[PDB]
Amino acid sequence: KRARSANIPGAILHSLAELQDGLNAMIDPSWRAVRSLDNWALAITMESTELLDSYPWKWWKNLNATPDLANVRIELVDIFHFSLSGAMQMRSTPDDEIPAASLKPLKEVMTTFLPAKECTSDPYGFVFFPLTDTQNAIASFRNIIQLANAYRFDVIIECIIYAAEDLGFNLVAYYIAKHTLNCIRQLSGYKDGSYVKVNNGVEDNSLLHNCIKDVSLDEVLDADKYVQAWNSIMANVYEAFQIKESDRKDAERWFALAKENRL
Amino acid sequence: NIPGAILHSLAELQDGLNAMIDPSWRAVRSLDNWALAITMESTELLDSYPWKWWKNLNATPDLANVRIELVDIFHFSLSGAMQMRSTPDDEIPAASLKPLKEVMTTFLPAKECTSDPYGFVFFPLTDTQNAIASFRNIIQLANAYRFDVIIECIIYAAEDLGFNLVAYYIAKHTLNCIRQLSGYKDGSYVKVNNGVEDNSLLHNCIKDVSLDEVLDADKYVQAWNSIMANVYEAFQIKESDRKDAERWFALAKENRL
Ligand SMILES: O=c1ccn([C@H]2C[C@H](O)[C@@H](COP(=O)(O)O)O2)c(=O)[nH]1
Ligand SMILES: O=c1ccn([C@H]2C[C@H](O)[C@@H](COP(=O)(O)O)O2)c(=O)[nH]1
Numbered sequence: 001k002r003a004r005s006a007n008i009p010g011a012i013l014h015s016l017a018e019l020q021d022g023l024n025a026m027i028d029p030s031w032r033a034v035r036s037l038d039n040w041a042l043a044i045t046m047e048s049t050e051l052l053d054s055y056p057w058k059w060w061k062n063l064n065a066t067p068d069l070a071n072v073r074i075e076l077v078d079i080f081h082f083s084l085s086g087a088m089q090m091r092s093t094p095d096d097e098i099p100a101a102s103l104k105p106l107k108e109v110m111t112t113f114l115p116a117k118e119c120t121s122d123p124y125g126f127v128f129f130p131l132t133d134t135q136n137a138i139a140s141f142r143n144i145i146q147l148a149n150a151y152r153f154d155v156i157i158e159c160i161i162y163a164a165e166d167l168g169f170n171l172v173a174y175y176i177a178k179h180t181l182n183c184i185r186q187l188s189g190y191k192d193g194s195y196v197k198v199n200n201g202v203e204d205n206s207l208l209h210n211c212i213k214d215v216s217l218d219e220v221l222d223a224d225k226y227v228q229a230w231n232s233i234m235a236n237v238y239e240a241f242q243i244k245e246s247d248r249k250d251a252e253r254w255f256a257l258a259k260e261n262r263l
Numbered sequence: 264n265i266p267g268a269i270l271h272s273l274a275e276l277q278d279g280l281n282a283m284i285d286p287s288w289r290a291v292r293s294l295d296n297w298a299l300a301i302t303m304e305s306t307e308l309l310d311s312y313p314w315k316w317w318k319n320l321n322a323t324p325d326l327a328n329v330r331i332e333l334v335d336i337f338h339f340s341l342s343g344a345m346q347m348r349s350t351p352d353d354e355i356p357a358a359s360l361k362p363l364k365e366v367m368t369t370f371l372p373a374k375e376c377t378s379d380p381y382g383f384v385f386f387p388l389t390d391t392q393n394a395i396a397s398f399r400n401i402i403q404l405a406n407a408y409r410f411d412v413i414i415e416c417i418i419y420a421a422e423d424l425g426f427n428l429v430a431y432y433i434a435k436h437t438l439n440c441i442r443q444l445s446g447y448k449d450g451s452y453v454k455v456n457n458g459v460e461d462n463s464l465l466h467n468c469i470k471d472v473s474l475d476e477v478l479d480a481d482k483y484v485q486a487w488n489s490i491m492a493n494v495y496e497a498f499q500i501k502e503s504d505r506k507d508a509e510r511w512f513a514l515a516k517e518n519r520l
């Protein structure tokens with residue numbers, strides 16, 4: 001009876017991509033025509049440094065500070081949205097519109113940073129473990145930025161998956177939770193500026209950690225249990241933000257909206 | 264454009280500020296430290312711009328904050344250039360020696376524009392996409408340890424944005440000392456509280472300051488001092504806690520023995 005590792009099966013990645021398409025479409029219905037590949041690379045760039053800022057990297061300020069690993073988890077998930085969006089758009093881009101950099105050998109467009117102390121890494125050698133270590137984090141995310149510059153969105157997804165497994169959290173479960181917060185934000189005036197993220201005292205991101213305490217690694221990838229497992233996660237997030245039933249969506253509605261779109 | 268001998272003197276103030284943080288900074292810091300700092304400041308710069316297509320869609324570029332970030336990147340690139348000069352040759356990262364074409368992919372904005380002489384920074388920098396392509400190029404320059412190229416780009420950036428880079432440097436330099444004095448290292452001092460950020464009080468300290476005052480390779484020492492004093496005054500810093508430009512020069516010359 002074999003154990004399901006932390007790799008995301010193809011079938012599940014498809015479903016993840018359908019959710020992502022739905023969220024992107026809430027933002028702009030023609031998101032593929034409107035967004036550029038550079039947008040997603042930029043967004044990954046910004047989230048990467050925002051992640052690094054969770055570590056005490058600064059030698060001139062706040063010594064005796066420890067990494068804010070709760071925030072690292074959310075930032076990884078944010079990067080995952082943007083890379084998944086980027087990988088999808090890559091597949092949707094015409095060939096004459098393909099940036100030359102995406103096709104040149106990686107070694108030509110990138111320098112791989114390595115930490116000074118011995119460590120293990122992901123299979124590509126871009127991300128370094130343990131990620132509780134600031135120097136490992138720094139080298140990893142300087143590599144992610146350069147991957148984003150060479151449009152390697154699929155390599156990035158792979159790296160995030162190993163990153164989540166090092167840090168010991170359920171990436172897919174967090175994805176579902178953050179996806180749901182993202183949808184909530186779009187329903188509640190994120191664009192026009194009326195939304196309150198740091199409401200009552202806590203950042204809205206911080207409420208998600210409790211919404212996924214129940215879910216298991218297998219439970220969220222098992223072809224039998226996953227739709228239900230994803231749905232309870234969505235429900236937990238919706239309920240936490242006091243979102244009415246009529247405004248909610250379930251995983252199957254997202255699959256239906258995506259399929260309806262491919263026509 | 265900053266005469267060579269002025270740049271040489273800014274380097275000495277940077278040296279002095281660096282030694283306040285760690286006495287033997289050149290041995291303690293690494294090339295990667297500076298390249299990372301610039302990377303982190305580069306994205307803080309971009310986040311002054313309304314780059315998010317999903318949130319805050321009529322936000323205004325915060326150009327006042329862009330001036331401050333440009334100046335921080337300047338502190339960090341001066342430090343890197345210095346770090347390079349005192350790094351032994353056999354420890355010089357190989358990427359620094361390659362032609363620029365080999366170590367970067369130059370991001371261009373979609374709409375036509377002018378640029379700096381290298382074609383890395385794009386004008387006007389009031390424009391979000393021009394800013395974005397500029398600082399995604401700066402990050403790549405940082406990765407290749409090209410601190411001197413970065414310094415040149417920042418100078419051209421300041422010129423396009425119409426503010427006085429050297430005056431801003433002296434002001435932020437003064438604030439950095441103030442921070443170290445007030446115990447920034449251990450948390451006794453915070454840079455932002457109740458919607459008041461210390462950098463934001465710098466602008467009124469140097470509003471009046473001419474390009475010619477601060478660059479005149481004859482009468483610039485006095486101009487820098489008056490900036491230093493205005494900033495110290497703006498933060499209510501006692502006289503005995505202040506330092507002047509000649510103190511930092513002397514500090515640096517005495518450290519070079
Ligand atoms: O087209 C978009 C734009 C944004 N996001 C999501 C991805 C991240 O999880 C989240 C980050 O937004 P902030 O929390 O930083 O505002 O937004 C998308 O999924 N698609
Ligand atoms: O070795 C150092 C460390 C920090 N700084 C300065 C550069 C920036 O102007 C300023 C940024 O500090 P924060 O605003 O990030 O705290 O600190 C230096 O000059 N040298």
Ligand SMILES: [Mg+2]
Pocket residue numbers: 304307331332335
């Ligand atoms: Mg700054």
